[PDB]
Design a protein around this nucleic acid. Structure first.
Ligand SMILES: [Zn+2]
Ligand SMILES: [Zn+2]
Lengths: 319, 48, 255, 31
RNA sequence: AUCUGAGCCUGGGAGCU
């Protein structure tokens, strides 16, 4: 059964499990002959209801398209010999660290300059994938990798897809129930299906806050609980602060706390301290997606062009 | 047969089903009804 | 030389996987044309985009540069390729629906098998297998560029009439169905060949731009009129074998 | 910025002539 | 008289090695 363009994954030796992905198990492995490290992401063809998952087809398409210094790199796609069935493995370039691990490790200390550099690389990645008409739809600390050389990589595009600026006419009806609840923006929780790049930058704000809090800032347990936490921290969701939010079928059917004033800076002051940092976080966690800052504006924000300028990570990583 | 604006995203492209059902007549009108008719009727290619 | 992977020379096309098993060139090209026609039919019954059909056809053409028709019949591979393209091109169709349409197309006499019968679940297993084999044979290279994109863009640029745009697009589809240009020349080159042929047929002539350059110069920098006419000759040569019923049905009946 | 295409009254190109004598006058297939 | 596939077309099948 000829198959010249799909090597067997046997060429790599699995070393350890490293978490559960959007649709599979992930293993660290090294090439048996060269020692090149890779990450094997196993396509879990459990959902045999529709054959090969469209989610994986999208991921493969997108990662064949996106090539950027801050986007994870797909090397190849491998198979297993029919033993008692076959499986497909996505082979990625390996990254030593993930942001969540670094933030949980107490010996790792970030300088303000290094946080600036992390957020700069992050927003470069988001800028690149957005300008290539791709939504990530799964921004979270655990999906932000950092290599040994301190180069940030956006990862886990299993939930990503292409989007349209279409067309002053029939609006899109994208998949609503996306993004991990803690990093999910308000519009998705209110049932928005014609959303866009702004949802990823909401996650960037949440991630930027974690750079100082070392812990997710809104750890809700339900979609309603999460909405309540968002109202508590960012202020109440009202037409006054979010024009046309009335039009959401569920805006009143869900009942959102109305008294809460905005307390983002008030509550984060003690952790962030830096004024510019607080301002950028404030612009990233805006409720109305139409007013939320975009990658380019974020990258021109004074946070990235005031002293101390961003610096390389290599220093902080060795601890 | 009918052009489609390539700038449309894949999920936006219109469906290929012709407005009228394919017949078995081989007249001029019927030989250019759609791609299937043209390939089978006008060019004589069939799989069955 | 990674571009030239899915683009071949006449020496490479002559030594096809089907040639290895004793299959006449004309017979392989026939199997290809039939697979394309079947893909178009199924696609029109499913009501998928033309983009999906074109992608499925390119999949088929590339699939049979590695595998042989001896081992994989075109009438079995085609529904798998279309089912895959529907996903790739963001218009997925239920596996049940595809197997139903395929049965309707290939067995109009038989009744649509019951969704519970062992034979239906066997058809499902076969389809999903073929999908996995198509994916692995192609190396999961699923992003396909088609001549239609450049044909339409060019007809817009030169301010062509509705009839000339329709004809150019139609010839692009015919190029995918009837020839192996997708394995020989890049989509822009095929787009130029298609527009040129539609012009020669319609007697439309596209003039030079306000800046003095021929229209094909705005589509691909390698398209010379010499090679353009050469590949139009190759197209028409691939068309000479067509049972040219047209020369015969040309002047007879209406509705 | 691009003059609309213009017919060629009585085309003589060997390629065009062969295609047309093959197919059958583009003006006819409009029906 | 029944099966088979194959090649030929022709206002399209119950026509021919
Ligand atoms: Zn038709
Ligand atoms: Zn008719």
């Amino acid at each position: 059964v000829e198959c010249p363009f799909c090597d067997e994954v046997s060429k790599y030796e699995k070393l350890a499990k490293i978490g559960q992905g959007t649709f599979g198990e992930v293993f660290k492995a090294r090439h048996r002959k060269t020692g090149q490290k890779v990450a094997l992401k196993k396509v879990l063809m459990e959902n045999e209801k529709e054959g090969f998952p469209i989610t994986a087809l999208r991921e493969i398409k997108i990662l064949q398209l996106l090539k950027h210094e801050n986007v994870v790199n797909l090397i190849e796609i491998c198979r297993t010999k029919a033993s008692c069935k076959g499986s497909i493995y996505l082979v990625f370039d390996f990254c030593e660290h993930d942001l969540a691990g670094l933030l949980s490790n107490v010996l790792v200390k970030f300088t303000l300059s290094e946080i600036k550099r992390v957020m700069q690389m992050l927003l470069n990645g988001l800028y690149y994938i957005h300008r290539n008409k791709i939504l990530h739809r799964d921004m979270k600390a655990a999906n932000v990798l950092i290599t040994r050389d301190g180069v940030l990589k956006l990862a886990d595009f299993g939930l990503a897809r292409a989007f349209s600026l279409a067309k002053n006419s029939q609006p899109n009806r994208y998949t609503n129930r996306v993004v991990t609840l803690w990093y999910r923006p308000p519009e998705l929780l209110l049932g928005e299906r014609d959303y866009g790049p702004p949802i990823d930058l909401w996650g960037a704000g949440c991630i930027m806050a974690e750079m100082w809090t070392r812990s997710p800032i809104m750890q809700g347990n339900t979609e309603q609980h999460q909405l309540a936490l968002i109202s508590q921290l960012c202020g109440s969701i009202t037409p006054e602060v979010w024009p046309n939010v009335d039009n959401y079928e569920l805006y009143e059917k869900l009942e959102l706390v109305k008294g809460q004033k905005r307390k983002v800076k008030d509550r984060l002051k003690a952790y962030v301290r830096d004024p510019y940092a607080l301002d950028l976080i404030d612009k990233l966690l805006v409720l109305d997606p139409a007013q939320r800052i975009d990658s380019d504006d974020a990258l021109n924000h004074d946070f990235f062009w005031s002293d101390p300028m961003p610096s390389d990570l290599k220093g902080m990583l060795s601890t | 047969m009918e052009p489609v604006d390539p700038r449309l995203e894949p999920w936006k492209h219109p469906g290929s089903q012709p407005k009228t059902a394919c017949t078995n007549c081989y007249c001029k009108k019927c030989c250019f009804h759609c791609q299937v008719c043209f390939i089978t009727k006008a060019l004589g290619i069939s799989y069955g | 030389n990674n571009n030239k992977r899915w683009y071949f020379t006449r020496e490479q096309l002559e030594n096809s996987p089907s040639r290895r098993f004793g299959v006449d060139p004309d017979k392989e090209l026939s199997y290809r044309q039939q697979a394309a026609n079947l893909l178009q039919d199924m696609g029109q019954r499913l009501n998928v985009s033309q983009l999906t059909i074109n992608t499925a056809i390119v999949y088929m053409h590339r699939f049979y540069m590695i595998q042989s028709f001896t081992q994989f019949p075109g009438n079995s591979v085609a529904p798998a390729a279309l089912f895959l393209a529907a996903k790739v091109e963001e218009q997925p169709k239920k596996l049940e629906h595809v197997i139903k349409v395929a049965h309707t197309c290939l067995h109009p006499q038989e009744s649509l098998p019951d969704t519970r019968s062992e034979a239906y679940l066997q058809q499902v297993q076969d389809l999903v297998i073929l999908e996995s084999i198509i994916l692995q044979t192609l190396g999961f290279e699923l992003t396909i560029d088609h001549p239609h994109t450049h044909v339409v863009k060019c007809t817009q640029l030169v301010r062509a009439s509705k009839d000339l745009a329709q004809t150019s697009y139609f010839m692009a589809t015919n190029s995918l169905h009837l020839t192996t240009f997708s394995l020989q020349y890049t989509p822009p080159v095929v787009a130029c060949v298609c527009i040129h042929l539609a012009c020669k047929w319609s007697n439309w002539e596209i003039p030079v731009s306000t800046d003095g350059k021929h229209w094909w110069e705005y589509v691909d920098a390698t398209v010379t009129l010499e090679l353009l006419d050469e590949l139009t000759h190759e197209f028409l040569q691939i068309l000479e074998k067509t049972p040219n019923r047209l020369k015969r049905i040309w002047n007879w009946r209406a509705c | 910025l691009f003059a609309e295409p213009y017919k060629v009254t009585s085309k003589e190109d060997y390629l065009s002539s062969r295609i047309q004598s093959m197919l059958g006058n583009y003006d006819e297939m409009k029906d």
